[PDB]
């Protein structure tokens, strides 16, 4: 068969990943402008949410040193790939868990809804890529609302998890956070309600 | 019009098959036995069709389309054409032709048992694009018997005709498919004295092509003679 | 030495090739733009002829399963490369051998003369390819014309024959076809009349 | 009734596949955690069913013919079951499944988007004879994508299935076809860690058994646990 | 040492076993003899009982693609090997799991006693072979019924059985189903109460 | 009379020698130059004369007394004969005709300087056997002289005509002997152009099948085309 | 692929085949019982004919060392292959050309008609193998009778010789001699009119 050049093997970010991609949590000073996790502006259409979530080993056990990147459409469900601090939106953010309580956070829109490749629309969601000392090649997951039951039941990608009771791990738990909107979307990254990783 | 201004290097023909090929029982007959007469590249051959403005159709490359579903193995038959030199050759005609899934020809003279399938035709053209790159979709054809020795059959294999930048050029070939354990047994491919020779007509596998889901690729690239700027002559 | 990447070895057309290069023949529904036996059209600037011919094996059979290209200069002397339907005249066409008869034809006009590489003229000809079951690489050939005799007896190509007994199986036939203007040309593959074939 | 006369050769579960064979996607939630019990031979492990008296049709063994033709490669698929001694199993009961030519199975869960075969079943059933052989004619499956990694590929392959002369013999298995490339890219073919245990899977192009002018042959034997009668118990 | 030929490596039984070997199931006509289900006929001697069952990955999810094949003894604890529709008993079946329900049922008689190699008698039971994709070669087990525990306690194959707790795995509970006695076999593969599996 | 219940594995024309081998003078003449014309099989291929009912006589196969003895090295020659699949061919005629201890041939048209042996006629005859074995006594007959190239000496050999079950099988052939020199140098050897086939013809010294203090002896079998019954027909 | 056991290599008759298989030939004292031109006895059923011919070589020159060998089906169509002198017919024979005259002579009646595997029949013909000196492999031809053209038309055998004009090569020309029905059937080897030989 035709080979390819074989891709560049991954390793473990290390517990020091936030060094290089968390200056703040590192307790290091940081530069001009960083990739954080505030993806839109006050002002950016849409509705506003926090989203928060834990990360738990096989063990039960929080994941202190995880490192995440989200990447979301826009309310109108457009993915904004030109990333700029100036921008009301921004697709792409990252976040951290503290190593105190362990709990990452973002500030977003909930997305708008975007089709797969044969035209079918998504349910609005999330893609989160997860890093951490301990994960060889990061895990890849989506995130989904709870209030987009209508949605979910019919997303095309939801639907290619074979047992239903998987797909339940995928979805955020709406909640409310100093009066505000949030969800929930805790990782188990082993064992007992592990959640959903997927390959592309 | 076309004008004089290439060279093309002069063909193996120790490379390419000789005319006369006992084992392949129709090459007898059919192979001159005088010498072939060497003349010097003139206009007459350093030239050729251009088929740039050939009103193609939006299926002419699609056998999956161009005739129900075929029933058969879905594959992309994908490459490039370059020439000796490596240079890509672009917007160049190749035309491909073969049997049916069951090594049925769409042809009256084939009289082969297996069926014809209602939605395949097994045509295909698709002019090279700016890179040298062509592609078709169809079905893996099926080896077929013939009357050469008494057990005779042919590899599955694809019908190839490349026109190239001149006549000089143009070429007719058959692509056989990796693996094949009937290749090594065919008269025809044997008429290639060269084992070299006959891995060149051996499309391989290629699933950073494929369509998950869908349908496999083999990749298929082509080499025509190296073109060259006359110089002192 | 230095060696460049090998040529595709050539393989014969086999007995269908009419599926894939003359689609009318295999008796198979035709495309929109066909390649086939018409060079020129009614209005074309020439002498309009009419070519025809048998092929013949090495034992005086006819070829009948014959696929022919040609490619040949317009009356004025020139190669037409731009192939379209919608031109007067191609210089490049496709014919094929009657199941039947075993008879192929070609609607064009006598093609003017054009000048070899050193600058010297060549007689009117019409380039030929021959391809068939039976042929592992095609077969290269010269049509020129018997009413052509002085310019025929100048040719830089023809005069590279050897053999002037040899040159006569280059000759085509000028005769009359429903009082139009045809020139026969018969190619004898193998044997007594063998037809000259090039290699360049 | 059967009697407790044989002994069993024990199988070699490094020689066979493991449960547990990651790449197998599926092999995670179904295979033990707990080590299997070994248990002596009694009587219910070494009898089994005996089908000679099964009332097989005309074509059971006959794909061509038992559901127009079927489009696709013509082939018979034969061999000899034996057991570990070399010893011939007769009115041994061989069943098998597969793909139509397109890689399409003619089962409610098959989704590929290849087309059914009006005329393809894709089952058959033969009793082994008294020399232990076996003979189906059928069409060469095409192979077919599955849900594993995002671009996997069953190579082609026929299911089979063989009785033996008890349950301690009965096993199923896949006949896979000599040069297909897709075979070491499998991770169920994977699921055999020794390459040689591999090659045993790998039907083999016989020239011998084909019809001229109609269809090819593979043979595919199968060696089936060692028989051994009982001594010193 | 001897080594003997190598015995033809096992492979799953993939989705699509049906198509082979339950050809109703698979929604496919049947042929005029098909092994199935119901090894005894109504006028056949010995406890007429039905078995059902489900099969549990280890997620706790039912494996709706199973196939099973039974070999039991007759009443008198007798193997009838010669298989024949004519028979009233048959000692071998086949079944397998609803694509819903994932639930097999099998009609039968309670096999007799049959003695092991060592003329030691084995409580009444019935031989198992479980098929599906997701395995690779074939589980084996046993089903006791729960109303022979005094047979029970002293057959030498559930006494090899290191940990008592694992021989309950392979007791089927007796029920009735519209009247009939019935008993309920679930096999677990993975996990929480793993049936036992043998090799032999 | 004979049926058609039995079809033969084609034979490998690659294998056996061609009919034009230039170096075997005679061969330019006497070969073909239109390719052979394949046909299926038929009752009238399929089938042959069986000569279990000829009455051969006492010393048929006894050269040493069916013709003084003669002057030359005793020899046992025998072997068996099978066919591809290594069955043995029971009934079947073989036939040997060779020279003399000095190479001289009991024929008119032989005319080297060589004697002939009063004692001598070089013909034999037997049936195989139940287990398709034969045997002649004989002497080792001599190289000789023959006119192709200038100095050209056929090694020594004995000719051999078997009969098989069908005209297909029947087959006229050579024995030479193990370790003669003469064998790479024979322009009637080499008419076979794969080695491995030249080594088929060598009858192996057999020690323990001669008779001590009597004769040597050498063992050379013979392999007919497989017989195996039609199929899917 | 299966490879089975190499047939044993062909090698050719050699000029003093007739030794061992034509001693009266050879000019030798012939054993008890030999096999040879007479397939039939007097009181034959069938119609009593005699075969005669020469066999050329490529330059045009009697072949004086050739030996044949014949099989052909009796009067009724019928194969006799239990080869007996005592027989009135035997289907096998066996001839060589004269040292002088250069011809063979076969004593038959004319063959009934056989049905190829198809069920189809065959035209009468008897099946020839021609061995000699500088024929490294037996050549294979069949015998057709002149005055079965209807059948001959038919011939599935004949049928499948592409070229005609070859067909006629297998024709034996029916003629008298001593007013006894004979039929000339010549071999050309190689060549003008080269005999069809086949490959089975
Ligand atoms: O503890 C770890 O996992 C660890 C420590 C250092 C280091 O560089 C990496 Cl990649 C991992
Ligand atoms: O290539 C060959 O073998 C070849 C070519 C020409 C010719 O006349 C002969 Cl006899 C042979
Ligand atoms: O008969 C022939 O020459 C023949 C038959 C089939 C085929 O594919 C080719 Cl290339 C040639
Ligand atoms: O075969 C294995 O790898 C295997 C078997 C049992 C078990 O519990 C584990 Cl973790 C692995
Ligand atoms: O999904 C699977 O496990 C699967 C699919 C197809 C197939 O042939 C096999 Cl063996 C397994
Ligand atoms: O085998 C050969 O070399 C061969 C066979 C036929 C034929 O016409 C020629 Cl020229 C050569
Ligand atoms: O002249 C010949 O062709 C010749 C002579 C002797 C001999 O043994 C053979 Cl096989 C052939
Ligand atoms: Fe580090
Ligand atoms: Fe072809
Ligand atoms: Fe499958
Ligand atoms: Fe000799």
């Not at chain 1, 960083?34 to 056990?61: M, S, T």
């Not at chain 1, 209508?150 to 409310?176: G, S, Y």
Request: charge should be negative; hydrophobic fraction near 35%.
């Amino acid at each position: 068969p035709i080979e390819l050049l074989p891709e560049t093997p991954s390793q473990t970010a290390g517990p020091y990943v936030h060094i290089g991609l968390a200056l703040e949590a590192a307790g290091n000073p940081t530069r001009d402008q960083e990739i954080w996790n505030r993806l839109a502006k006050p002002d950016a259409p849409g509705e506003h949410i926090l989203l928060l979530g834990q990360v738990y080993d096989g063990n039960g056990h929080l994941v202190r040193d995880s490192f995440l990147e989200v990447w979301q459409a826009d309310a109108n469900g457009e993915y904004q790939d030109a990333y700029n601090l100036e921008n009301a939106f921004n697709s792409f953010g990252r976040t951290a868990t503290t190593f105190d309580a362990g709990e990452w956070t973002l500030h977003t829109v909930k997305p708008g809804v975007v089709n797969n490749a044969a035209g079918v629309p998504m349910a609005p969601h999330i893609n989160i890529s997860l890093f951490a000392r301990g994960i060889n090649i990061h895990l890849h997951t989506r995130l989904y609302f709870d209030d987009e039951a209508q949605a979910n039941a019919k997303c095309p990608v939801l639907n290619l998890i074979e047992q239903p009771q998987r797909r339940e791990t995928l979805i955020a738990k709406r909640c409310e956070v100093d009066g505000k909107t949030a969800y929930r979307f805790d990782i188990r990254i082993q064992g007992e309600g592990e959640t959903v990783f997927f390959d592309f | 019009p076309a004008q004089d201004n290439s060279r093309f290097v002069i063909r193996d023909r120790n490379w390419h098959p000789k005319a006369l090929t006992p084992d392949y029982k129709t090459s007898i007959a059919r192979s001159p036995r005088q010498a072939l007469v060497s003349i010097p590249q003139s206009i007459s051959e350093t030239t050729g069709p251009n088929f740039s403005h050939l009103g193609f159709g939006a299926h002419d490359h699609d056998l999956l389309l161009n005739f129900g579903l075929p029933i058969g193995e879905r594959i992309i038959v994908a490459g490039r054409v370059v020439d000796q030199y490596g240079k890509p050759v672009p917007n160049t005609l190749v035309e491909m032709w073969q049997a049916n899934a069951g090594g049925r020809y769409r042809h009256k003279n084939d009289r082969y048992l297996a069926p014809l399938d209602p939605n395949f035709g097994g045509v295909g053209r698709c002019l090279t694009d700016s890179d040298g790159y062509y592609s078709f979709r169809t079905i893996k054809p099926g080896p077929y018997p013939w009357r050469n020795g008494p057990n005779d059959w042919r590899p599955a294999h694809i019908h190839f005709g490349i026109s190239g930048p001149s006549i000089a050029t143009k070429l007719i070939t058959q692509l056989y498919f990796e693996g094949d354990p009937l290749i090594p047994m065919c008269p025809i491919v044997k008429s290639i004295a060269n084992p070299e020779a006959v891995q060149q007509l051996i499309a391989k596998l290629d699933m950073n092509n494929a369509n998950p889901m869908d349908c496999l690729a083999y990749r298929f690239d082509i080499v025509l003679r190296g073109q060259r700027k006359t110089h002192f002559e």
